């Protein structure tokens, strides 16, 4: 299944749409601050964004911004983040 659920991606879509989405995408200029707010270093956001950037277009779409929300909230109370976009984090749009 998808590492992220509908309730976990539902809150991600609110933070993703709280920065002003463009055609379904957020520029690091909207996410960077979203990740810099997790009290984590740019090493987690520099790596959480990448694994979050499913298209590598310099933005986090509703599905990409989702993978970067649990990757940031887990580095605060759960564990760090690896740099290998796991296949369990890919949304259905990448099927």
């Amino acid at each position: 299944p998808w590492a992220v659920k509908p309730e976990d991606k539902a809150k991600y879509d609110a933070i993703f749409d709280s920065l002003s989405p463009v055609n379904g995408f957020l520029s690091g200029d909207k996410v960077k601050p979203v990740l810099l707010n997790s009290k984590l270093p740019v090493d987690i956001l520099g790596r959480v964004w990448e694994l979050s950037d499913i298209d590598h277009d310099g933005m986090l779409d509703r599905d990409e911004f989702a993978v970067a929300m649990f990757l940031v909230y887990c580095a605060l109370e759960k564990e760090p983040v690896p740099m290998s976009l796991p296949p369990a984090l890919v949304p259905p749009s990448k099927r």
């Binding site: 090493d43 520099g46 964004w49």
Partner: peptide, 6 residues
């Protein structure tokens, strides 16, 4: 270039 964090 990319990833505006690092």
């Amino acid at each position: 270039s990319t990833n505006p964090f690092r």
